[PDB]
Design an enzyme around this catalytic site. Structure first.
Site, mmCIF file in Angstrom:
data_model
loop_
_atom_site.group_PDB
_atom_site.id
_atom_site.type_symbol
_atom_site.label_atom_id
_atom_site.label_comp_id
_atom_site.label_asym_id
_atom_site.label_seq_id
_atom_site.Cartn_x
_atom_site.Cartn_y
_atom_site.Cartn_z
ATOM 1 N N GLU A 142 18.206 -4.023 48.746
ATOM 2 C CA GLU A 142 19.132 -4.909 49.229
ATOM 3 C C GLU A 142 19.345 -6.365 48.536
ATOM 4 O O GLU A 142 18.124 -6.751 48.255
ATOM 5 C CB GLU A 142 19.058 -5.418 50.737
ATOM 6 C CG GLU A 142 20.100 -6.456 51.264
ATOM 7 C CD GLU A 142 20.160 -6.449 52.895
ATOM 8 O OE1 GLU A 142 20.791 -7.558 53.105
ATOM 9 O OE2 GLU A 142 18.965 -6.028 53.368
ATOM 10 N N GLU A 146 23.941 -15.537 51.442
ATOM 11 C CA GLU A 146 24.185 -15.685 52.716
ATOM 12 C C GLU A 146 24.503 -17.222 53.188
ATOM 13 O O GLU A 146 23.478 -18.072 52.824
ATOM 14 C CB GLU A 146 23.057 -15.163 53.572
ATOM 15 C CG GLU A 146 23.019 -13.887 53.994
ATOM 16 C CD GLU A 146 21.763 -13.200 54.492
ATOM 17 O OE1 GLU A 146 20.787 -13.421 53.836
ATOM 18 O OE2 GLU A 146 21.759 -12.828 55.596
#
Ligand SMILES: OC[C@H]1O[C@@H](O[C@H]2[C@H](O)[C@@H](O)[C@H](O[C@@H]3[C@@H](O)[C@H](O)O[C@H](CO)[C@H]3O)O[C@@H]2CO)[C@H](O)[C@@H](O)[C@@H]1O
Ligand SMILES: OC[C@H]1O[C@@H](O[C@H]2[C@H](O)[C@@H](O)[C@H](O[C@@H]3[C@@H](O)[C@H](O)O[C@H](CO)[C@H]3O)O[C@@H]2CO)[C@H](O)[C@@H](O)[C@@H]1O
Ligand SMILES: [Ca+2]
Ligand SMILES: [Ca+2]
Lengths: 241, 233
Positions: free
Chosen positions: A53, A57
């Protein structure tokens, strides 16, 4: 089962390497997470398989920057590299073009065409297999990370004007760059042959991701964070001038 | 099977950069190694991958000192920089706060807040990827490095009062530094969702690492080096 409703957009198919860009305005409020990420589906399974991943964010308590991250290792034994990058104007006060580049040698993060982070080797060498392009809106239980959840600011909205996905073509891109434009989505509607709407949740998530909080309006895809059973967007879509 | 039992404590997770502190009292006896180190698991695989590691090792022959080191290169062909720094009072006679700062520019070692070493660039530019925070207690079969093993001093124990891990947050750190406290563990209990216990061994180590030699008693994580069979106190 949880008291709040969030959303997650994701490509039905995954790919090996590429460049991904998204023109969006993030949603922000203490306790929330507005993102854009590559994700190897299944990484959450704890059967010993690795975790793959790469993240961008926006932590609600600090819309003035976004957190970058690469997650390798495995469920229960993650290896991370969280960093923070200022953005101007703040993520929730303007549209920005966030870029993500992934090759067997590096992963690069860009904001409005400008590089803000480039990791070479190390974790990048373990970003094996494929990953899909995802975007989700939710709230984290870890108050230390995102701050206490400010329920009163709800409903919140994340707007994505468009997305461009590129193929990895080393040295053959414009100016000798490494990518070639593959497909673009201006979100004049939702493409069910291309994207899927998430309807699940995970440990540490204060909300339930639902397809009820993903829709298009005025050329834009909207991810919504609303109280459980209060899913709707009667407001107005900002303009990306 | 070795005739002795050692121990290793390690974080399940790994990260890139940060500050790591541990309030400890080291084990010391000729031939032993009591340590604190950053480690990129998998570095021991000789498949071409690089070796990434930063150490603090109290060599049992001289408890009034510890060895610093950065290991790069790769298995079977390492790049090292062993150095020795005086510790007062001796590491096995008192508690000292050992610090390890790792950023993309340098690596800094500290004892009681005092800098004992700082390496900029060079090997530090090759500390790619992530590393976990580890601590072990064993004995080396290299006489010139630790000294002939003095068995009579067993059992030996390494005490860890607490551990603090900080995230590398350049410019937005606390106390005028580039670090932000992430988590703390006073070891009033053993947190299995945080730490793992070593249960292996390696060439040059005359001991087998086992969970039997790691336990928390009265707000303190303890590492023990005992002869195989006599693991307790
Ligand atoms: O839980 C079942 C469900 O999991 C989906 O995958 C989740 C996964 O469980 C989460 O761990 C992951 O969380 C991401 C974090 O690892 C990262 O630090 O931050 C990002 C951005 O906020 C988080 O999304 O999210 C994925 C996707 O939601 C599977 O996709 C699904 O099939 C399965 O049913
Ligand atoms: O051998 C299998 C086992 O290896 C663990 O990794 C070991 C590695 O094999 C050792 O070479 C390494 O040794 C460290 C030295 O390189 C350093 O100079 O000093 C430190 C502290 O004194 C030594 O520990 O230690 C690591 C950790 O024990 C793997 O972690 C494990 O998964 C694997 O099964
Ligand atoms: Ca559009
Ligand atoms: Ca304690």
């Amino acid at each position: 089962a949880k008291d709040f409703s969030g959303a997650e957009l994701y490509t039905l198919e995954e790919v090996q390497y590429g460049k991904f860009e998204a023109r969006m305005k993030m949603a922000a409020a203490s306790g929330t997470v507005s993102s854009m990420f590559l994700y190897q589906n299944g990484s959450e399974i704890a059967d010993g398989r690795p975790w793959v991943e790469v993240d961008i964010e926006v932590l609600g308590k600090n819309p003035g920057s976004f957190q970058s991250n690469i997650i390798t290792g495995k469920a229960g034994a993650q290896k991370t590299s969280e960093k923070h990058h200022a953005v101007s104007p703040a993520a929730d006060q303007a549209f920005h073009t966030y870029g993500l580049e992934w090759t067997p040698n590096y992963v690069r993060w860009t904001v409005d065409g400008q590089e803000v982070r480039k990791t070479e080797g190390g974790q990048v060498s373990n970003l094996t297999g494929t990953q899909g392009l995802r975007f989700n809106l939710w709230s984290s239980e870890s108050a230390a990370w995102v701050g206490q959840f400010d329920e009163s600011k709800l409903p919140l909205f994340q707007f994505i004007n468009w997305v461009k996905v590129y193929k990895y073509t080393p040295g053959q891109g414009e100016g000798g760059s490494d990518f070639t434009l593959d497909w673009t989505d201006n979100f004049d509607t939702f493409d069910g042959s291309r994207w899927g709407k998430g309807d699940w949740t995970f440990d540490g998530n204060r909300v339930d991701l639902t397809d009820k909080n993903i829709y298009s309006r005025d050329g834009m895809l909207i991810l919504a964070l609303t109280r459980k059973g209060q899913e709707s967007f009667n407001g107005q879509v900002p303009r990306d001038d």
